[PDB]
Each structure stands twice: as structure tokens, then as C-alpha cells.
Amino acid sequence: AFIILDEVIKVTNRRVNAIEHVIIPRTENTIAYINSELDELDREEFYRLKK
């Protein structure tokens, strides 16, 4: 039981660390980039309509 618990907790802890330190930053940077692009499009659309 000791061995099994040790290996299981090691695996889960490293997985949690990897998720926290990799996934969330990677996705939120993309979120910001997408927001920036969608904000960019409307600017030129408004310019064209103004013209």
C-alpha cells in the first residue's frame, strides 16, 4: 500500500504542477491574442464605413 500510494501521489502532484505551469499561461496568451485581433478588425471596418 505504501509503494502504491507513493507512486500515485508522485504522478498526480507532477501532473498538477505541469498543468498549472504550462497549460493556463499558454491558453490565456492565446486568449489575449484573439481578443486583440477581434478588436483590430472592427477598427478598419469603422474606417471603411466612415469613408
Binding site: 478588436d39 477598427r43 469603422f46 474606417y47 466612415k50
Partner: protein, 594 residues
């Protein structure tokens, strides 16, 4: 000589026969004389901006010309007054109309034109050369402030040929006759000034004198120099009202100008009901705070231009009061609302947007507005000196701080006092997240500390590192528990908790902890650091810290209770008691080691 309307479009109006009008004059359009300002001039026709609602207008209505840009009248009687965004008295308006509305097309003097004021001559005589900004007489405005001085408006010089002697006058009796190439110059107890132009000043100075608020944490770790800027987040559950009230009641300033720059309305009702009840007790319970404050109220219903010009009006008033030699403290309410109004105006004008839809002016506008603050020596003969210290209040879009407004404000201002809601439920009523809030005026304030309290910087630093170490320690404490921690680490942890629960937390209602002066806080952090370092030193030579804590539980309780000590008793006898307590702790530790 008048102007006939030629077109109308919602808030847009086009005049006619307008020749000889500046680009920002004011115009009394309509029979009811609605207020407006010219924007674009093309030959004879000139675009006009309206403030009230234009429904019902008809072509051919006469149009007038004021003869100046947006301006505000300055003089005795500002105190105890409540104004709109465009210098409009609300109490007088309500009394005059007897209604509960602001009837459109209503004009009343900004200052009461009937109350008689007792004037006293200054120090000049007929035939003496004079210059703008020179004091030539005082007026008794209130028991609180009685030296309300009278200036000569900038951009005015010459020689005085007649000055009224002492007596009682109203605001419509020429009390001076300056003679220039044209002797037409007359002067009364008041004058005006365009809002958008900063007031001239002799020279700016470097603000060094600290602004003390009476709170412990504020002046202890994140001080604000008297003459600088600052920013605090605007949230619902944070409860910033405590900060504003404490600043108004206990600060060392001499005049407060609160500005409501667009609120939900009910909050304005709350603050207006509350302020006339706050009482200050210096040289006796001088009943009101209204005798030391003018308030600018702008509910959302107010016209967009009025809702936008609020901060300009407030800062102009603050600069005027600064030039009299007094000290002022401006307090905005929600700069986000002001930015919203600016963006709305820009959109209505139909102009190119920019980052996140805002116009391109925001950066320059905010930079100039903040630069208008500071400390300087007034412009005049007596060579008095004053100071201004704006206190902004930024509210986010929906919590995120990616908006341009917050970024620009943080980039410009120098002091941030982060407030956290989570502490509210835990009731750290001064809810300052010590890990985020920061100050940048320490480098200057040290030149004052050394002159007065040389040890203050090292002590405040020491507790900064102590708190950082304790919060970091708790992280691994959770991982491995306190079991694997040396006695020094536990000492750090428990002293950190004691500091958190005594030095930082502050009831604010108890007679003793309501307003903590400087020397008292000085003694407090000296005592706390002495306790901690002495205990750790005693443990260093070798001793079970559990036994030491058992022995010195009384000492710990005494240092905790010292905060309950009532100030305002001797203000030096307090220092004697603190010295006695420090010596007692020292000798108790010395005996305990034995």
C-alpha cells in the same frame, strides 16, 4: 448682433450671423437661454453644442454670446457649498424653484449675491504699483477659516487710484480701481477663470513633507508626501468610505474638495447625508466638516459635458485655494466614469477611435491633469506657499486591469493602496493587501525622518522583510507542518501574526485607536521590533522557546495592550510610558534568560 438658428440635430445646433466669435465661446441659445459652446466655425455658420435637451426648439430663435470660455467664479462663499459639474448651486436652485427637479433653462449666480461680507484693507495705498496675484485684503469667512484672502487676478497690473476702506460689502461693489493705459479696470470681491488653463504660479517645488492621515499602516509602510498623487482601487465590498472619512477628519490639510464624477445617485445621497454629520475636534468640537469643504455632485442624469468637466472644475478650485497659501487635498471618486464620459463625447462628435475604442486624448489629458498637481510658491508679493495633493479612485471595467485607464493611471501616479474584499469578511477593516500596495516617496521622506525620527526607515523595512518572510514561511509550513521548523521560524510566524492583529488591524471607532498620531506609531514599531529581535537573540544563545513564551506571555500581552493605550493624554508622557514598557521588557527578558 444676435444669431438666428439655422439647423438642429439632437444635441447639434447650427447658428447664423455669427461673426466675431471664438472657437470656445459660450452661447445662450434658445428663448430659455440654454447653455452651449461653439465647436466649429465655417464662415458665418458655427456649430454649437448643447447641454440640456433641445426638444421643442424652433428655427429663428435668437442666439447670444457670453464672451469667455467655460469658466468658474471664485471668491468668498465657496465653503459649505454643494455644486454641480458646471458650477451650479443645488441648494439655492431647489429653494428658488421649490420643486425637486433642475428646471432646464435656469440661471442663478454661482455665489450668493446678497450676503454682506466684512472686508479689511490690506497693506497697499493709492498710487502704489501693483501686480497680478498680490493680496490686497482679507475677509472673515468662518470661525474655522477666517483669513480668506483677496487676490488680484493674473494678467492684470498697473497702479491703484482708489481702494475702498474697511466696512461690510456684497459681491457687487467695486472695491478697487486699477489704472492702466485704460482706467476702465474695476474689481469686486470675486472674479472668474477659464477652467481648462492651469493657473500661473511662480515656481514648482519638490514635495517632501509627509502627508499623515492618522492611520497606522498608511503612514507606517506606504506614506504619501504632502503634494503628490496617489491611487486606490474602486470596489463595492472594499469599503473605501473609511479612507475618505479618515482623510477628511484627521489629515493635516486645510481644505478638502470632494468631487463626485458620476455615481449611481443613491451613493451620492448617502455621502451628502453623511458628511454634514462628521465632526472634528480641534481646539474644541468645531461642529461641521462642511465648513472646510466644497463638494461637486454629478449623478448620471447630469449632462455629459457637465459630467466630464467635473474634475477640471475641482482641480481649478483646489489650485485657487492653494495659491492663498493654504494646503488642499483633492479627492476624485471614479475616474473610470470620467473616461467613459470623455469617450461618449468623442463618439458623439464622430471621431476616430483608438485602443479599446477610446480616443487618442486620454494619455495626454491624464498626464496634463496629474501634472497640474504638486507644490509651489504662490504668485504675489507676500510670498506665501501652498500645496495640492490629488487622491484618485480608479474603478475597473469588470475587475480586470487591462483597460487603458488603469494602465495610464498606474503609470502616472506614484502611490497605490491596494484594497482587498477578502479581508472585509475577516474584518481587517483597513483592508490593505500588503503584498501589492507600494509607495515611492520614501527616498524623499527619509530626509524628514532623519531630521525627526532617524530610525523609522530601518524599522519599517525590517517589518517589510518580516512580513515577507512570514508569508513565505507559511507556504512550506502547510507542506511539512510546523514540526520541521526551527524555533526561529516559529518566532517569526507568531510575531508576524501578532503584528497583523495589532499593528495593522484598527477598529477606527474606539476613542484610542480612532486616530493614531506619528510619535505613537513610532514607539509602536520600535517596541515590536525590539520584542522580536530580543526574543530571537535570547533563543540564539540556546533556550527552549516554548519555555520563553510561557515566561513572557505577560510581556506579549503587555505589548499587545499598548495599542489599546489612549493617546491624546500627554503626547510626551506617552513616550515616558513607552520607555518604561521597553525597559521592563528588556529586564524581563534578561531575567528570563537566567
Amino acid at each position: 448682433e444676435y444669431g438666428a438658428i439655422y439647423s438642429v440635430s439632437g444635441p447639434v445646433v447650427i447658428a447664423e450671423n455669427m461673426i466675431g466669435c471664438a472657437m470656445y465661446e459660450l452661447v445662450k441659445v434658445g428663448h430659455d437661454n440654454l447653455v452651449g459652446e461653439v465647436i466649429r466655425i465655417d464662415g458665418d455658420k458655427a456649430t454649437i453644442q448643447v447641454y440640456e435637451e433641445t426638444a421643442g426648439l424652433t428655427v429663428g430663435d435668437p442666439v447670444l454670446r457670453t464672451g469667455k470660455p467655460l469658466s468658474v467664479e471664485l471668491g468668498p462663499g465657496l465653503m459649505e457649498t454643494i455644486y454641480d459639474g458646471i458650477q451650479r448651486p443645488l441648494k439655492a436652485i431647489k429653494e428658488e424653484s421649490q420643486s425637486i427637479y433642475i428646471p432646464r433653462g435656469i440661471d442663478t449666480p454661482a455665489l450668493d449675491r446678497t450676503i454682506k461680507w466684512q472686508f479689511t484693507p490690506g497693506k497697499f495705498q493709492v498710487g502704489d504699483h501693483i501686480s497680478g496675484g498680490d493680496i490686497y485684503g482679507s475677509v472673515f469667512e468662518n470661525s474655522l477659516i477666517s483669513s480668506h484672502k483677496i487676490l488680484l487676478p493674473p494678467r492684470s497690473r498697473g497702479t491703484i487710484t482708489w481702494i475702498a476702506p474697511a466696512g461690510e460689502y456684497t459681491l457687487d461693489e467695486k472695491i478697487l480701481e486699477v489704472e492702466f493705459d485704460g482706467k476702465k479696470s474695476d474689481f469686486t470681491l470675486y472674479h472668474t477663470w477659464p477652467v481648462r488653463v492651469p493657473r500661473p504660479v511662480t515656481e514648482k517645488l519638490s514635495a517632501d513633507y509627509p502627508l499623515l492621515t492618522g492611520q497606522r499602516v498608511l503612514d507606517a509602510l506606504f506614506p504619501c508626501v504632502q503634494g503628490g498623487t496617489t491611487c486606490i482601487p474602486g470596489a463595492f465590498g472594499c469599503g473605501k468610505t473609511v479612507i475618505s472619512q479618515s482623510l477628511s477628519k484627521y489629515s493635516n490639510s486645510d481644505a478638502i474638495i470632494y468631487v463626485g464624477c458620476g455615481e449611481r445617485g443613491n451613493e451620492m445621497a448617502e455621502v451628502l447625508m453623511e458628511f454634514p454629520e462628521l465632526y472634528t475636534e480641534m481646539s474644541g468640537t468645531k461642529e461641521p466638516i462642511m465648513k472646510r469643504t466644497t463638494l461637486v455632485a454629478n449623478t448620471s442624469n447630469m449632462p455629459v459635458a457637465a459630467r466630464e468637466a467635473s474634475i477640471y472644475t475641482g482641480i481649478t478650485l483646489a489650485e485657487y485655494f492653494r495659491d492663498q497659501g493654504k494646503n488642499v487635498s483633492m479627492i476624485a471618486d471614479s475616474s473610470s466614469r470620467w473616461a467613459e464620459a470623455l469617450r461618449e463625447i468623442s463618439g458623439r462628435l464622430g471621431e476616430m477611435p483608438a485602443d479599446q475604442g477610446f480616443p487618442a486624448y486620454l494619455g495626454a489629458k491624464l498626464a496634463s491633469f496629474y501634472e497640474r498637481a504638486g507644490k509651489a510658491v504662490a504668485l504675489g508679493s507676500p510670498d506665501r506657499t501652498g500645496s495640492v495633493s490629488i487622491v484618485a479612485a480608479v474603478s475597473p471595467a469588470g475587475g480586470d486591469f487591462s483597460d487603458p485607464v488603469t494602465t495610464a493611471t498606474l503609470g502616472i501616479t506614484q502611490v497605490f493602496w491596494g484594497l482587498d474584499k477578502k479581508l472585509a469578511q475577516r474584518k481587517h477593516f483597513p483592508s490593505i493587501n500588503t503584498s501589492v500596495s507600494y509607495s515611492k516617496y520614501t527616498n524623499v521622506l527619509n530626509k524628514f525622518y532623519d531630521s525627526n525620527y532617524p530610525e523609522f526607515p530601518v524599522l519599517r523595512d525590517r517589518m517589510k522583510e518580516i512580513l515577507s518572510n512570514a508569508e513565505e514561511l507559511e507556504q512550506v509550513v502547510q507542506l511539512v507542518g510546523k514540526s520541521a521548523l526551527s524555533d526561529s521560524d516559529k518566532i517569526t510566524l507568531d510575531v508576524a501574526t501578532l503584528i497583523k492583529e495589532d499593528f495593522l488591524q484598527q477598529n477606527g471607532y474606539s476613542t484610542y485607536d480612532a486616530f493614531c498620531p506619528i510619535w505613537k506609531t513610532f514607539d509602536m514599531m520600535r517596541a515590536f521590533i525590539s520584542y522580536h529581535d530580543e526574543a530571537q537573540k535570547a533563543v540564539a544563545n540556546g533556550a527552549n522557546w516554548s519555555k520563553l513564551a510561557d515566561s513572557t506571555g505577560d510581556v506579549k500581552h503587555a505589548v499587545s495592550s499598548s495599542k489599546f493605550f489612549e493617546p491624546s493624554r500627554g503626547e510626551k508622557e506617552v513616550h515616558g510610558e513607552f520607555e518604561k514598557l521597553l525597559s521592563t521588557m528588556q529586564e524581563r527578558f534578561a531575567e528570563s534568560t537566567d
